[PDB]
Enzyme design. Structure first.
Site, PDB file in Angstrom:
ATOM      1  N   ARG A 114    -122.500  18.478 -52.417  1.00 38.07           N
ATOM      2  CA  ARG A 114    -121.757  19.128 -51.351  1.00 38.07           C
ATOM      3  C   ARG A 114    -120.486  19.510 -52.107  1.00 38.07           C
ATOM      4  NH1 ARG A 114    -116.931  17.385 -48.543  1.00 38.07           N
ATOM      5  NH2 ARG A 114    -116.629  18.590 -46.613  1.00 38.07           N
TER       6      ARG A 114
ATOM      7  N   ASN B 142    -112.167  20.313 -56.671  1.00 40.36           N
ATOM      8  CA  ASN B 142    -111.087  21.286 -56.492  1.00 40.36           C
ATOM      9  C   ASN B 142    -109.709  20.705 -56.819  1.00 40.36           C
ATOM     10  OD1 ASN B 142    -109.532  23.595 -55.167  1.00 40.36           O
ATOM     11  ND2 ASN B 142    -109.094  21.971 -53.673  1.00 40.36           N
TER      12      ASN B 142
ATOM     13  N   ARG C 237    -128.598  18.698 -41.169  1.00 41.07           N
ATOM     14  CA  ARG C 237    -127.970  17.458 -41.603  1.00 41.07           C
ATOM     15  C   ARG C 237    -127.623  16.636 -40.376  1.00 41.07           C
ATOM     16  NH1 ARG C 237    -122.524  17.996 -44.831  1.00 41.07           N
ATOM     17  NH2 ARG C 237    -121.867  18.615 -42.722  1.00 41.07           N
TER      18      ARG C 237
ATOM     19  N   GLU D  36    -118.938  23.762 -48.881  1.00 43.15           N
ATOM     20  CA  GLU D  36    -118.236  23.617 -47.622  1.00 43.15           C
ATOM     21  C   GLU D  36    -117.237  24.744 -47.535  1.00 43.15           C
ATOM     22  OE1 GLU D  36    -114.929  21.384 -47.512  1.00 43.15           O
ATOM     23  OE2 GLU D  36    -114.743  21.182 -45.335  1.00 43.15           O
TER      24      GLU D  36
ATOM     25  N   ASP E  69    -117.077  20.195 -52.094  1.00 40.40           N
ATOM     26  CA  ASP E  69    -115.949  20.047 -51.190  1.00 40.40           C
ATOM     27  C   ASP E  69    -114.891  21.141 -51.424  1.00 40.40           C
ATOM     28  OD1 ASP E  69    -114.424  18.353 -49.192  1.00 40.40           O
ATOM     29  OD2 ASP E  69    -113.073  18.098 -50.912  1.00 40.40           O
TER      30      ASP E  69
ATOM     31  N   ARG F 143    -106.738  29.935 -52.928  1.00 37.90           N
ATOM     32  CA  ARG F 143    -107.399  29.456 -54.139  1.00 37.90           C
ATOM     33  C   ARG F 143    -106.474  28.799 -55.177  1.00 37.90           C
ATOM     34  NH1 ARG F 143    -110.829  33.760 -53.133  1.00 37.90           N
ATOM     35  NH2 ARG F 143    -112.742  33.023 -52.111  1.00 37.90           N
TER      36      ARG F 143
ATOM     37  N   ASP G 125    -103.871  20.872 -57.458  1.00 39.50           N
ATOM     38  CA  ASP G 125    -104.905  21.876 -57.695  1.00 39.50           C
ATOM     39  C   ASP G 125    -105.350  22.050 -59.150  1.00 39.50           C
ATOM     40  OD1 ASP G 125    -106.343  23.485 -55.800  1.00 39.50           O
ATOM     41  OD2 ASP G 125    -105.524  25.272 -56.801  1.00 39.50           O
TER      42      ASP G 125
ATOM     43  N   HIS H  18    -111.419  27.035 -51.316  1.00 45.95           N
ATOM     44  CA  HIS H  18    -110.241  26.982 -52.171  1.00 45.95           C
ATOM     45  C   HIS H  18    -110.522  27.184 -53.647  1.00 45.95           C
ATOM     46  CE1 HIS H  18    -108.068  25.885 -48.629  1.00 45.95           C
ATOM     47  NE2 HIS H  18    -108.996  24.980 -48.374  1.00 45.95           N
TER      48      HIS H  18
ATOM     49  N   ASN I 232    -119.396  16.791 -38.152  1.00 40.96           N
ATOM     50  CA  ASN I 232    -119.272  16.257 -39.506  1.00 40.96           C
ATOM     51  C   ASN I 232    -118.125  15.247 -39.495  1.00 40.96           C
ATOM     52  OD1 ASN I 232    -116.817  17.701 -39.747  1.00 40.96           O
ATOM     53  ND2 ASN I 232    -117.318  18.450 -41.799  1.00 40.96           N
TER      54      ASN I 232
HETATM   55  C1  LIG Z   1    -109.460  19.392 -44.324  1.00 35.79           C
HETATM   56  C2  LIG Z   1    -110.036  20.786 -44.544  1.00 35.79           C
HETATM   57  O1  LIG Z   1    -108.907  21.751 -44.751  1.00 35.79           O
HETATM   58  C3  LIG Z   1    -109.306  23.144 -44.969  1.00 35.79           C
HETATM   59  O2  LIG Z   1    -109.920  23.656 -43.851  1.00 35.79           O
HETATM   60  C4  LIG Z   1    -109.231  24.596 -43.008  1.00 35.79           C
HETATM   61  C5  LIG Z   1    -110.040  25.927 -42.880  1.00 35.79           C
HETATM   62  O3  LIG Z   1    -110.127  26.512 -44.183  1.00 35.79           O
HETATM   63  C6  LIG Z   1    -109.252  26.920 -41.915  1.00 35.79           C
HETATM   64  O4  LIG Z   1    -110.000  28.116 -41.779  1.00 35.79           O
HETATM   65  C7  LIG Z   1    -109.235  26.133 -40.574  1.00 35.79           C
HETATM   66  O5  LIG Z   1    -110.653  25.856 -40.226  1.00 35.79           O
HETATM   67  C8  LIG Z   1    -110.933  24.898 -39.207  1.00 35.79           C
HETATM   68  C9  LIG Z   1    -110.582  24.884 -37.729  1.00 35.79           C
HETATM   69  O6  LIG Z   1    -109.753  23.699 -37.644  1.00 35.79           O
HETATM   70  C10 LIG Z   1    -109.285  23.398 -36.349  1.00 35.79           C
HETATM   71  O7  LIG Z   1    -108.475  22.230 -36.428  1.00 35.79           O
HETATM   72  C11 LIG Z   1    -108.533  24.541 -35.705  1.00 35.79           C
HETATM   73  O8  LIG Z   1    -108.161  24.120 -34.399  1.00 35.79           O
HETATM   74  C12 LIG Z   1    -109.487  25.787 -35.663  1.00 35.79           C
HETATM   75  O9  LIG Z   1    -108.785  26.849 -35.080  1.00 35.79           O
HETATM   76  C13 LIG Z   1    -109.770  26.119 -37.164  1.00 35.79           C
HETATM   77  O10 LIG Z   1    -110.616  27.248 -37.250  1.00 35.79           O
HETATM   78  O11 LIG Z   1    -108.460  24.868 -40.727  1.00 35.79           O
HETATM   79  C14 LIG Z   1    -109.093  23.932 -41.611  1.00 35.79           C
HETATM   80  C15 LIG Z   1    -108.251  22.644 -41.663  1.00 35.79           C
HETATM   81  O12 LIG Z   1    -106.912  22.931 -41.975  1.00 35.79           O
HETATM   82  C16 LIG Z   1    -110.269  23.204 -46.171  1.00 35.79           C
HETATM   83  O13 LIG Z   1    -110.664  24.555 -46.327  1.00 35.79           O
HETATM   84  C17 LIG Z   1    -111.498  22.267 -45.954  1.00 35.79           C
HETATM   85  O14 LIG Z   1    -112.343  22.354 -47.070  1.00 35.79           O
HETATM   86  C18 LIG Z   1    -110.978  20.830 -45.803  1.00 35.79           C
HETATM   87  N1  LIG Z   1    -112.129  19.855 -45.601  1.00 35.79           N
HETATM   88  C19 LIG Z   1    -112.633  19.069 -46.835  1.00 35.79           C
HETATM   89  C20 LIG Z   1    -111.517  18.899 -47.886  1.00 35.79           C
HETATM   90  C21 LIG Z   1    -110.712  17.797 -47.927  1.00 35.79           C
HETATM   91  C22 LIG Z   1    -109.647  17.712 -48.980  1.00 35.79           C
HETATM   92  O15 LIG Z   1    -110.176  16.918 -50.038  1.00 35.79           O
HETATM   93  C23 LIG Z   1    -110.847  16.602 -46.909  1.00 35.79           C
HETATM   94  O16 LIG Z   1    -109.592  16.427 -46.271  1.00 35.79           O
HETATM   95  C24 LIG Z   1    -109.317  15.087 -46.002  1.00 35.79           C
HETATM   96  O17 LIG Z   1    -108.672  14.425 -47.146  1.00 35.79           O
HETATM   97  C25 LIG Z   1    -107.288  14.834 -47.413  1.00 35.79           C
HETATM   98  C26 LIG Z   1    -106.800  14.083 -48.661  1.00 35.79           C
HETATM   99  O18 LIG Z   1    -106.717  12.694 -48.435  1.00 35.79           O
HETATM  100  C27 LIG Z   1    -106.421  14.497 -46.140  1.00 35.79           C
HETATM  101  O19 LIG Z   1    -105.075  14.880 -46.375  1.00 35.79           O
HETATM  102  C28 LIG Z   1    -104.212  13.723 -46.269  1.00 35.79           C
HETATM  103  O20 LIG Z   1    -103.602  13.446 -47.584  1.00 35.79           O
HETATM  104  C29 LIG Z   1    -102.704  14.485 -48.060  1.00 35.79           C
HETATM  105  C30 LIG Z   1    -102.159  14.071 -49.434  1.00 35.79           C
HETATM  106  O21 LIG Z   1    -101.277  15.045 -49.947  1.00 35.79           O
HETATM  107  C31 LIG Z   1    -101.535  14.636 -47.014  1.00 35.79           C
HETATM  108  O22 LIG Z   1    -100.653  15.663 -47.445  1.00 35.79           O
HETATM  109  C32 LIG Z   1    -102.137  15.032 -45.662  1.00 35.79           C
HETATM  110  O23 LIG Z   1    -101.106  15.172 -44.700  1.00 35.79           O
HETATM  111  C33 LIG Z   1    -103.077  13.887 -45.223  1.00 35.79           C
HETATM  112  O24 LIG Z   1    -103.670  14.182 -43.970  1.00 35.79           O
HETATM  113  C34 LIG Z   1    -107.007  15.326 -44.980  1.00 35.79           C
HETATM  114  O25 LIG Z   1    -106.276  15.101 -43.791  1.00 35.79           O
HETATM  115  C35 LIG Z   1    -108.444  14.895 -44.751  1.00 35.79           C
HETATM  116  O26 LIG Z   1    -109.038  15.604 -43.673  1.00 35.79           O
HETATM  117  C36 LIG Z   1    -111.978  16.790 -45.857  1.00 35.79           C
HETATM  118  O27 LIG Z   1    -112.432  15.529 -45.474  1.00 35.79           O
HETATM  119  C37 LIG Z   1    -113.164  17.669 -46.441  1.00 35.79           C
HETATM  120  O28 LIG Z   1    -114.180  17.792 -45.501  1.00 35.79           O
HETATM  121 CA   LIG Z   2    -107.886  25.561 -55.573  1.00 32.37          CA
HETATM  122 CL   LIG Z   3    -119.465  19.450 -44.544  1.00 36.16          CL
END
Ligand SMILES: C[C@H]1O[C@H](O[C@H]2[C@H](O)[C@@H](O)[C@@H](OC[C@H]3O[C@@H](O)[C@H](O)[C@@H](O)[C@@H]3O)O[C@@H]2CO)[C@H](O)[C@@H](O)[C@@H]1N[C@H]1C=C(CO)[C@@H](O[C@H]2O[C@H](CO)[C@@H](O[C@H]3O[C@H](CO)[C@@H](O)[C@H](O)[C@H]3O)[C@H](O)[C@H]2O)[C@H](O)[C@H]1O
Ligand SMILES: [Ca+2]
Ligand SMILES: [Cl-]
Ligand SMILES: *[C@@H]1O[C@H](CO)[C@@H](O)[C@H](O)[C@H]1NC(C)=O
Length: 496
Positions: A195, A100, A337, A233, A197, A158, A167, A201, A298
């Site tokens: 998977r 993505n 898993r 995911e 990722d 998206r 993006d 989005h 996870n």
């Molecule tokens: C992290 C997560 O955000 C979104 O998820 C959203 C979801 O859509 C929304 O409905 C809700 O659900 C979930 C529930 O969540 C609870 O908390 C609330 O309390 C509930 O109410 C809510 O319903 O909140 C989630 C988290 O905000 C994406 O839709 C997922 O696909 C993504 N996960 C995958 C994608 C990425 C990106 O590559 C990875 O991020 C990883 O990798 C990136 C890139 O390294 C890291 O970002 C880091 O590097 C960037 C660089 O720019 C910095 O800006 C950022 O501050 C820094 O943390 C990031 O933290 C790290 O987890 C993950 O390891 C991977 O598993």
């Molecule tokens: Ca996108």
């Molecule tokens: Cl997962």
């Protein structure tokens, strides 16, 4: 494609979070294959940004720099070596595909990448792919900050940047081709699936466009016509405009409501009780079983990141954790898993862990090898949940009862339940604050069975509790609320 492509008889994959290729290769041979595990989900195998502030966090692997198989887990040689050895033993490899985006837009240009590849986030330049300004959605997004600001607008979710991650314009054939080139390279090496990722989005249609460009699995290991296993995911906890059902045409989806709800029930939060799990499954509003990839926790939510929130159970909550994994592995819903983690110095300040960025066990950034202690546990801070007897035996329990229907359910109206899987297995839980002692209908053939949670069937005898099933299928079970593991499980293969 919705098929895992595992060997008939193996029903689970384990996520060896951040493991090195050479370690996974060894593990496939000395443990995974012998114990019946179907496969391994590996961390992103492609070159990522080397972040030193904070010092090499686990999430730097989600910021791609190129598609070269060169990371802290090993090089292309070691990766290919791992896939071959694992396959030659019947254990599949699933790749965590980060297609993505590339790295954060705030990242500095230079060669601070796990392979020396040069990249320039600012000018949108990644020559090692190659990619340029023409391949990103900068012009397509319409938010004032360029990042995803509102999850209720399915369009910016998206086209804009998830927390600054550059993006990729997945509607362009060029970009789709460079991604498929990457994935086919992996498929031809021998990987069995991916998977996807951050699937929420990406538009369902752009994903489909890429999957159309994918090869069939390596004919040296898989039957002709095999398609890669795809699980997307998508964190769908209801309430948002995007639904995981929109992705059923591309493959399975991660069912995040699974761990979240199971977490609250076992913790007994706000009224929840195990007796309510009788109709666990679609009945709880989950996606259809044949489109579900399930898990208790996870890498994200085990450290206050992903979905599930505060209800998620992890190795930290050992006793309740083994019980949830046990229930999951015994129940017929979805493809399971298992998670395998490492310990990090959690430091809760104001109710939040300030050390949730901490990377895998290491020495100066070089990941530590997985060492096996004499009791089969692991050293160097690897938790190795997949090696815990209670979990390892339930992995085998799922294989033994695969296909058997859900039957003989029992509940005391509170937190003491039990059920079997046809005439191949039976499991009992006591999550009430008082002892359980009763005779139940198991549906198993007469005989003496080893409880696989408290012990093992060591040819001829058991090392733990023994259950005696009579001719009418009834058996007495006794579980104190003080037991180390408040649940008992027996199956056809643990019969004396
Ligand atoms: C992290 C997560 O955000 C979104 O998820 C959203 C979801 O859509 C929304 O409905 C809700 O659900 C979930 C529930 O969540 C609870 O908390 C609330 O309390 C509930 O109410 C809510 O319903 O909140 C989630 C988290 O905000 C994406 O839709 C997922 O696909 C993504 N996960 C995958 C994608 C990425 C990106 O590559 C990875 O991020 C990883 O990798 C990136 C890139 O390294 C890291 O970002 C880091 O590097 C960037 C660089 O720019 C910095 O800006 C950022 O501050 C820094 O943390 C990031 O933290 C790290 O987890 C993950 O390891 C991977 O598993
Ligand atoms: Ca996108
Ligand atoms: Cl997962
Ligand atoms: C089971 O253990 C007992 C001793 O506790 C021994 O008499 C018996 O022969 C063992 N059974 C087998 C099949 O080795």
């Amino acid at each position: 494609q919705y098929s895992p492509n595992t060997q008939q008889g193996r029903t689970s994959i384990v996520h060896l979070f951040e493991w090195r290729w050479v370690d996974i290769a060894l593990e496939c041979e000395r443990y995974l294959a012998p114990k019946g595990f179907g496969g391994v989900q590996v961390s992103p195998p492609n070159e990522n940004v080397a972040i030193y502030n904070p010092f090499r966090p686990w999430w730097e692997r989600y910021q791609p720099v190129s598609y070269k198989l060169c990371t802290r887990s090993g090089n292309e040689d070691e990766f290919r070596n791992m896939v071959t050895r694992c396959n030659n033993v019947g254990v599949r490899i699933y790749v965590d595909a980060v297609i993505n985006h590339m790295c954060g837009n705030a990242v500095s240009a230079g060669t601070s990448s796990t392979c020396g590849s040069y990249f320039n986030p600012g000018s949108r330049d990644f020559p090692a792919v190659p990619y340029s300004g023409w391949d990103f959605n900068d012009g397509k997004c319409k938010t004032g900050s360029g990042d995803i600001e509102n999850y209720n607008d399915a369009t910016q979710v998206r086209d804009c940047r998830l927390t600054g991650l550059l993006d990729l314009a997945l509607e362009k054939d060029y970009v789709r081709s460079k991604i498929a080139e990457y994935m086919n390279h992996l498929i031809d090496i021998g990987v069995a699936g991916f998977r996807l990722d951050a699937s929420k989005h990406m538009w369902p249609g752009d994903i489909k466009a890429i999957l159309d460009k994918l090869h069939n699995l390596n004919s040296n290991w898989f039957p002709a016509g095999s398609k890669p296993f795809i699980y997307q995911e998508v964190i769908d906890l209801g309430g948002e405009p995007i639904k995981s059902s929109d992705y059923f045409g591309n493959g399975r989806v991660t069912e995040f409501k699974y761990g979240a709800k199971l977490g609250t029930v076992i913790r007994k939060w706000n009224g929840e009780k195990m007796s309510y799990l009788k109709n666990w499954g679609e009945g709880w509003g989950f996606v259809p079983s044949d489109r579900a990839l399930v898990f208790v926790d996870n890498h994200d939510n085990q450290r206050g990141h992903g979905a599930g929130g505060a209800s998620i159970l992890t190795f930290w909550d050992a006793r309740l954790y083994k019980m949830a994994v046990g229930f999951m592995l015994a129940h017929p819903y979805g493809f399971t898993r298992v998670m395998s983690s490492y310990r990090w110095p959690r430091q809760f300040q104001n109710g939040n862990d300030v050390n949730d960025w901490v990377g895998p066990p290491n020495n100066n950034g070089v990941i530590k090898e997985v060492t096996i202690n004499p009791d089969t546990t692991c050293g160097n801070d690897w938790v190795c949940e997949h090696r815990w007897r209670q979990i390892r035996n339930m992995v085998i329990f799922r294989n033994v009862v695969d296909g058997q229907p859900f039957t003989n359910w029992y509940d005391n109206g509170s937190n003491q339940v039990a059920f079997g899987r046809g005439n191949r297995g039976f499991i009992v839980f006591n999550n009430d604050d008082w002892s359980f002692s009763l005779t139940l209908q198991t549906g198993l053939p007469a005989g003496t069975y080893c409880d696989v949670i408290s012990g093992d069937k060591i040819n001829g005898n058991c090392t733990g509790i023994k259950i005696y099933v009579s001719d009418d299928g009834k058996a007495h079970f006794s579980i104190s609320n003080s037991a180390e593991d408040p649940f008992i499980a027996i199956h056809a293969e643990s019969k004396l």
